[PDB]
Scaffold this active site. Structure first.
Site, PDB file in Angstrom:
ATOM      1  N   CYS A 219      -1.879  -8.088  -4.251  1.00 47.69           N
ATOM      2  CA  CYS A 219      -1.235  -8.315  -2.955  1.00 47.69           C
ATOM      3  C   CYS A 219      -1.035  -9.786  -2.639  1.00 47.69           C
ATOM      4  CB  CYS A 219      -2.057  -7.657  -1.811  1.00 47.69           C
ATOM      5  SG  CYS A 219      -1.450  -7.972  -0.132  1.00 47.69           S
TER       6      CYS A 219
ATOM      7  N   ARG B  85      -2.171 -11.459   1.229  1.00 43.23           N
ATOM      8  CA  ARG B  85      -3.566 -11.496   1.657  1.00 43.23           C
ATOM      9  C   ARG B  85      -3.989 -12.609   2.608  1.00 43.23           C
ATOM     10  NH1 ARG B  85      -6.779 -10.934  -3.759  1.00 43.23           N
ATOM     11  NH2 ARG B  85      -4.759 -11.711  -4.614  1.00 43.23           N
TER      12      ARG B  85
ATOM     13  N   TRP C 217       3.910  -5.723   6.829  1.00 44.61           N
ATOM     14  CA  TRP C 217       5.362  -5.928   6.910  1.00 44.61           C
ATOM     15  C   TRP C 217       5.934  -6.348   5.580  1.00 44.61           C
ATOM     16  CZ3 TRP C 217       1.947  -8.996   9.973  1.00 44.61           C
ATOM     17  CH2 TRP C 217       1.675 -10.258   9.452  1.00 44.61           C
TER      18      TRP C 217
ATOM     19  N   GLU D 153      10.989  -6.700  -1.803  1.00 45.18           N
ATOM     20  CA  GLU D 153      10.581  -5.324  -1.949  1.00 45.18           C
ATOM     21  C   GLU D 153      11.765  -4.375  -1.693  1.00 45.18           C
ATOM     22  OE1 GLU D 153       6.601  -4.256  -0.589  1.00 45.18           O
ATOM     23  OE2 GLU D 153       6.718  -6.083   0.689  1.00 45.18           O
TER      24      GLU D 153
HETATM   25  C1  HEM Z   1       1.188  -8.516   5.755  1.00 44.33           C
HETATM   26  C2  HEM Z   1       2.160  -7.790   5.204  1.00 44.33           C
HETATM   27  C3  HEM Z   1       2.106  -7.625   3.745  1.00 44.33           C
HETATM   28  C4  HEM Z   1       3.018  -8.154   2.726  1.00 44.33           C
HETATM   29  C5  HEM Z   1       4.288  -8.968   2.860  1.00 44.33           C
HETATM   30  C6  HEM Z   1       2.336  -7.625   1.511  1.00 44.33           C
HETATM   31  C7  HEM Z   1       2.939  -7.824   0.234  1.00 44.33           C
HETATM   32  C8  HEM Z   1       2.647  -6.982  -0.912  1.00 44.33           C
HETATM   33  C9  HEM Z   1       3.593  -6.879  -2.071  1.00 44.33           C
HETATM   34  C10 HEM Z   1       4.959  -7.521  -2.265  1.00 44.33           C
HETATM   35  C11 HEM Z   1       2.880  -6.041  -3.047  1.00 44.33           C
HETATM   36  C12 HEM Z   1       3.388  -5.604  -4.408  1.00 44.33           C
HETATM   37  C13 HEM Z   1       4.141  -4.318  -4.074  1.00 44.33           C
HETATM   38  C14 HEM Z   1       5.335  -4.061  -4.954  1.00 44.33           C
HETATM   39  O1  HEM Z   1       6.291  -4.875  -4.969  1.00 44.33           O
HETATM   40  O2  HEM Z   1       5.332  -3.014  -5.624  1.00 44.33           O
HETATM   41  C15 HEM Z   1       1.578  -5.682  -2.391  1.00 44.33           C
HETATM   42  C16 HEM Z   1       0.561  -4.933  -3.098  1.00 44.33           C
HETATM   43  C17 HEM Z   1      -0.651  -4.476  -2.460  1.00 44.33           C
HETATM   44  N1  HEM Z   1      -0.957  -4.749  -1.179  1.00 44.33           N
HETATM   45 FE1  HEM Z   1      -0.142  -6.063   0.243  1.00 44.33          FE
HETATM   46  N2  HEM Z   1       1.210  -6.866   1.647  1.00 44.33           N
HETATM   47  C18 HEM Z   1       1.042  -6.916   2.993  1.00 44.33           C
HETATM   48  C19 HEM Z   1      -0.032  -6.207   3.691  1.00 44.33           C
HETATM   49  C20 HEM Z   1      -1.053  -5.377   3.078  1.00 44.33           C
HETATM   50  C21 HEM Z   1      -2.086  -4.646   3.854  1.00 44.33           C
HETATM   51  C22 HEM Z   1      -2.289  -4.579   5.356  1.00 44.33           C
HETATM   52  C23 HEM Z   1      -2.891  -4.016   2.784  1.00 44.33           C
HETATM   53  C24 HEM Z   1      -4.098  -3.162   2.968  1.00 44.33           C
HETATM   54  C25 HEM Z   1      -4.870  -3.387   4.000  1.00 44.33           C
HETATM   55  C26 HEM Z   1      -2.259  -4.345   1.478  1.00 44.33           C
HETATM   56  C27 HEM Z   1      -2.805  -3.985   0.177  1.00 44.33           C
HETATM   57  C28 HEM Z   1      -2.080  -4.052  -1.055  1.00 44.33           C
HETATM   58  C29 HEM Z   1      -2.551  -3.240  -2.188  1.00 44.33           C
HETATM   59  C30 HEM Z   1      -3.773  -2.338  -2.330  1.00 44.33           C
HETATM   60  C31 HEM Z   1      -1.532  -3.544  -3.181  1.00 44.33           C
HETATM   61  C32 HEM Z   1      -1.455  -3.028  -4.596  1.00 44.33           C
HETATM   62  C33 HEM Z   1      -0.604  -1.798  -4.673  1.00 44.33           C
HETATM   63  C34 HEM Z   1      -0.868  -1.234  -6.038  1.00 44.33           C
HETATM   64  O3  HEM Z   1      -1.840  -1.683  -6.743  1.00 44.33           O
HETATM   65  O4  HEM Z   1      -0.069  -0.332  -6.384  1.00 44.33           O
HETATM   66  N3  HEM Z   1      -1.062  -5.100   1.663  1.00 44.33           N
HETATM   67  N4  HEM Z   1       1.412  -6.217  -1.045  1.00 44.33           N
HETATM   68  C1  LIG Z   2       6.452   3.401  -8.950  1.00 41.42           C
HETATM   69  C2  LIG Z   2       4.983   3.056  -8.906  1.00 41.42           C
HETATM   70  C3  LIG Z   2       4.165   3.201 -10.032  1.00 41.42           C
HETATM   71  C4  LIG Z   2       2.800   2.875  -9.962  1.00 41.42           C
HETATM   72  N1  LIG Z   2       1.993   3.013 -11.041  1.00 41.42           N
HETATM   73  N2  LIG Z   2       2.258   2.421  -8.811  1.00 41.42           N
HETATM   74  C5  LIG Z   2       3.029   2.281  -7.710  1.00 41.42           C
HETATM   75  C6  LIG Z   2       2.382   1.770  -6.451  1.00 41.42           C
HETATM   76  C7  LIG Z   2       2.991   0.397  -6.220  1.00 41.42           C
HETATM   77  C8  LIG Z   2       3.802   0.385  -4.949  1.00 41.42           C
HETATM   78  C9  LIG Z   2       5.059   1.020  -4.864  1.00 41.42           C
HETATM   79  C10 LIG Z   2       5.778   0.978  -3.666  1.00 41.42           C
HETATM   80  C11 LIG Z   2       5.214   0.286  -2.579  1.00 41.42           C
HETATM   81  C12 LIG Z   2       3.953  -0.366  -2.659  1.00 41.42           C
HETATM   82  C13 LIG Z   2       3.337  -1.110  -1.502  1.00 41.42           C
HETATM   83  O1  LIG Z   2       2.320  -2.021  -1.954  1.00 41.42           O
HETATM   84  C14 LIG Z   2       4.356  -1.815  -0.576  1.00 41.42           C
HETATM   85  C15 LIG Z   2       3.767  -2.612   0.605  1.00 41.42           C
HETATM   86  C16 LIG Z   2       2.647  -2.208   1.375  1.00 41.42           C
HETATM   87  C17 LIG Z   2       2.172  -2.995   2.433  1.00 41.42           C
HETATM   88  C18 LIG Z   2       0.978  -2.606   3.271  1.00 41.42           C
HETATM   89  C19 LIG Z   2       2.847  -4.168   2.734  1.00 41.42           C
HETATM   90  C20 LIG Z   2       3.943  -4.547   1.963  1.00 41.42           C
HETATM   91  N3  LIG Z   2       4.605  -5.675   2.253  1.00 41.42           N
HETATM   92  N4  LIG Z   2       4.368  -3.776   0.943  1.00 41.42           N
HETATM   93  C21 LIG Z   2       3.247  -0.292  -3.858  1.00 41.42           C
HETATM   94  C22 LIG Z   2       4.400   2.590  -7.733  1.00 41.42           C
END
Ligand code: HEM
Ligand SMILES: Cc1cc(N)nc(CCc2cccc([C@@H](O)Cc3cc(C)cc(N)n3)c2)c1
Ligand code: HEM
Ligand SMILES: Cc1cc(N)nc(CCc2cccc([C@@H](O)Cc3cc(C)cc(N)n3)c2)c1
Ligand SMILES: C[C@H](O)[C@H](O)[C@H]1CNc2nc(N)[nH]c(=O)c2N1
Ligand SMILES: C[C@H](O)[C@H](O)[C@H]1CNc2nc(N)[nH]c(=O)c2N1
Ligand SMILES: [Zn+2]
Lengths: 411, 407
Positions: free
Chosen positions: A108, A111, A280, A285
């Site tokens: 993420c 963070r 947000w 994305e």
């Molecule tokens: C403040 C707004 C936020 C932005 C702009 C943000 C941005 C992102 C982005 C761009 C990703 C990669 C997702 C992708 O492109 O597939 C991500 C992954 C992640 N975010 Fe954040 N995030 C935000 C808030 C949060 C919040 C509130 C949480 C949980 C409390 C969180 C937990 C995670 C987790 C667990 C992943 C990994 C997803 C995975 O492993 O599949 N995000 N975030």
């Molecule tokens: C296709 C696929 C395969 C795989 N192995 N894992 C995944 C999960 C990855 C993912 C996909 C869409 C949206 C999020 C989210 O992380 C998107 C998100 C969430 C929050 C809280 C904020 C933010 N700015 N963005 C995470 C997807």
């Protein structure tokens, strides 16, 4: 043992000692790196160490390590584990736990915001209907008329793993997709399978390109039930471009609230299998992945068409050109409607500063480069040139199988 | 232990068995992933030799044959005596081609088997090395119709008799920082550009000044040589749409030729081994022109585009970045110098991966380096899980000579 990371743009070196507190395992070995692999019930025996570990961290963070209150709490959790085979978290523990999980999420980029998370405790919830109610308040509170606020809602932990709470949706708000018999998809191809379940469960499908899916909710290991988010609660933004007036005529819009509902929150060995959280969006994305992945809305062709680009040779970079225009439009649309969004230059810059600070105060910041680098314009953002260390701390967010793959149907 | 990789854009699944033959280490442990870190005796020589000869003889379907055993025997004897050994030509050719085949960070490997190898093992002086290098350059350049080649100088012995090429690439533009504070030409090459003057190069004090080769034979002080300008093919950079573009006065050399790496075959160390191929467009347009610690022309190009440079969210950097990259490709193509765009090269590498999975049982690949520095998620490699591991023969990094050479 100490570890150093270097920034290749600025020559700034940092030192990680935090990886030493690392519990979980990566997937890699001395002979293989699994750094780009997408995906790398407990006994008392394994539970109490994980409980103690967590409570030790909790009590340092409030600066009460070894206090009578630290010791009693340990003693009390101990008792409850041997008596009941599990335990219950205090409110403050749940709050701290959910904040840390986010903080530990190495994938993420968002963070820097970790310490402002609104935690909703839905641990008294017993039914689906209850779930729907909690989720509606989540959506409305986090939305905040476009001024988005981070929040998460926490339902009852796993027990015997036969009484799970799950939110079948991958996100609370996501658009349907429908495979046609000619082979084309209408709506979002990512969501085809889930839309079919929904249909199956008796959802009546509007069958348009931007139909918001119904929540599909399972309480206490019961069969899941459908619910329709009230549309007044679903903030959406119509997509126009500042210079291109035909852009609006592509008929595109997106929803404002990114809310992940399929992950698992582990805190002190407790498993919270429904914990939808929301933040947000970073522009890319939507603009790169949602619109432009070939296995999604895939509008590059139609946008490039309308731009009259040379599409006859890839070497014209027409794909790259359209991609940028589309991301310009996404940011412009959201900003114009006063819906919180962050561009990728700003998000990544912010994250470098978070990460530096995290080394200062915490002795590290686990970070997954493969995921932190944006899916366009990689090298012109500062994260590209940042070496990062990836390791797993708890508390944490973990993946879990899709519930339809594992659910025992009651009928 | 038989590992799978998935394409998430196509659901294609490949099973990797080739990693089981991995002989080197990654930097990763069970507890930490280092995927994003840039740089992590008679005794040990015989196994290394055996393992190499074993794959060699297997590749030519003569595993465990007369010729195989005898060679193992012969190499064994030579080691026992001389404390090293010499590769037969055929082995040298196989070693190099395979070092490139195993380069996990290289997207251009579909081409691996067509490397031209120039055996320079008989070389003894910098003048010699200079002559061998010019022939490499001329052969590889080929008037724009670029050809892969590598030139191999003599192997390390006692490690005080090292052959090294001090340049990091054969052809690179000078960099000099000025009283004004900033930098002229290429900031990457500042320090080396000094070592060259601190050694007697007169510098034309310009931007795109091709640097002198600085060559070290048999461990001696290194020596300067100017590559005949007629051998350095350059491309003036223009835009197919924007006529003011050319007025920035940009050019780039056609020949990417890495010259500071160490080639390891069957335990032997070739520390001078410059190799060259051709550019993927983004290497110049994204990295060379637009990196902040490089030519950093984005701010300048954006201006001429009259973009909104007020707020990051107008994506002006991104907008400019694309146009620049259009211009590089366009220019090289116009001048019929070989170049590949990132879309084409990544498509090719996916094809190569396929090939390697069914023919070799796998293909080591470092995702962090394979995905281009722009437009990542719209090339197919982005969605491709890759496994990264270290095979041998290989190219390896080695410390900057100046930190090491006894002056
Ligand atoms: C403040 C707004 C936020 C932005 C702009 C943000 C941005 C992102 C982005 C761009 C990703 C990669 C997702 C992708 O492109 O597939 C991500 C992954 C992640 N975010 Fe954040 N995030 C935000 C808030 C949060 C919040 C509130 C949480 C949980 C409390 C969180 C937990 C995670 C987790 C667990 C992943 C990994 C997803 C995975 O492993 O599949 N995000 N975030
Ligand atoms: C296709 C696929 C395969 C795989 N192995 N894992 C995944 C999960 C990855 C993912 C996909 C869409 C949206 C999020 C989210 O992380 C998107 C998100 C969430 C929050 C809280 C904020 C933010 N700015 N963005 C995470 C997807
Ligand atoms: C045919 C044209 C070629 C293309 C388009 C190509 C492409 C690339 C690219 C894009 C990189 C990443 C470099 C960076 O961004 O700095 C790379 C690195 C590499 N390439 Fe290839 N390449 C080609 C030919 C070759 C040849 C002929 C060899 C050796 C025989 C080779 C071996 C390597 C090595 C060893 C690295 C990086 C080593 C490291 O950093 O660990 N390449 N090349
Ligand atoms: C600043 C820096 C520090 C460091 N420790 N390592 C590096 C990476 C080494 C490298 C640098 C530039 C170009 C190449 C080469 O990979 C560029 C190249 C070579 C060939 C043969 C073909 C082709 N198309 N492209 C390799 C850079
Ligand atoms: C910090 C990071 O590992 C470093 O900047 C790497 C990332 N990926 C790269 N990829 C390529 N092709 N070339 C590079 O120089 C780099 N640099
Ligand atoms: C194979 C690879 O792990 C996969 O395609 C990843 C790469 N990086 C990513 N980065 C982000 N932010 N989101 C993603 O879905 C992915 N997908
Ligand atoms: Zn790793």
């Amino acid at each position: 043992r100490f570890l150093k990371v270097k920034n290749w743009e600025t020559d700034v070196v940092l030192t990680d000692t935090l990886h030493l507190k690392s519990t979980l395992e990566t997937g890699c070995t001395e002979h293989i790196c699994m750094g780009s692999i997408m995906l790398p019930v407990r006994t008392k025996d394994q539970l109490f160490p994980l409980a103690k570990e967590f409570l030790d961290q909790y009590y340092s963070s409030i600066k009460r390590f070894g206090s009578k209150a630290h010791m009693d709490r340990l003693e009390e959790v101990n008792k409850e584990i041997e008596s009941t085979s599990t335990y219950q978290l205090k409110d403050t523990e749940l709050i701290y736990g959910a904040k840390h999980a986010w903080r530990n999420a190495s994938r993420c980029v968002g963070r820097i915001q970790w310490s402002k998370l609104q935690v909703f405790d839905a641990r008294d919830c017993t039914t689906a209907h209850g779930m729907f109610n909690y989720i509606c308040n989540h959506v409305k509170y986090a939305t905040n008329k476009g001024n988005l606020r981070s929040a998460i809602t926490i339902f009852p932990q796993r027990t015997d793993g036969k009484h799970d709470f799950r939110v079948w949706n991958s996100q609370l708000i996501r658009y349907a997709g429908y495979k046609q018999p000619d082979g084309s998809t209408l709506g979002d191809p990512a969501n085809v399978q889930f839309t079919e379940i929904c249909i199956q469960q008796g959802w009546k499908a509007p069958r348009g390109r931007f139909d918001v899916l119904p929540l599909l909710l399972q309480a206490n290991g019961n069969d899941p039930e459908l619910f329709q988010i009230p549309p007044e609660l679903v903030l959406e933004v119509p997509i126009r471009h500042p210079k291109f007036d035909w852009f609006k005529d592509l008929g595109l819009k997106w929803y404002g609230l990114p809310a992940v509902s399929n992950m698992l929150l582990e805190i002190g060995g407790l498993e919270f299998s429904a914990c939808p959280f929301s933040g947000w969006y970073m522009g890319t994305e939507i603009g790169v992945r949602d619109y432009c992945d070939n296995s999604r809305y895939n509008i590059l062709e139609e946008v490039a068409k309308k731009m009259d680009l040379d599409m006859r040779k890839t070497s014209s970079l027409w794909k790259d050109q359209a991609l940028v225009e589309i991301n310009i439009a996404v940011l412009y649309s959201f900003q114009s409607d006063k819906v919180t969004i962050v561009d990728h230059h700003s998000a990544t810059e912010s994250f470098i500063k978070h990460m530096e600070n995290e080394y200062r105060c915490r002795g590290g910041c686990p970070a997954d480069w493969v995921w932190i680098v944006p899916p366009m314009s990689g090298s012109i953002t500062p994260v590209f040139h940042q070496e990062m260390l990836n390791y797993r701390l708890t508390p944490s967010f973990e993946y879990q199988p899709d519930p339809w793959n594992t659910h025992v149907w009651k009928g």
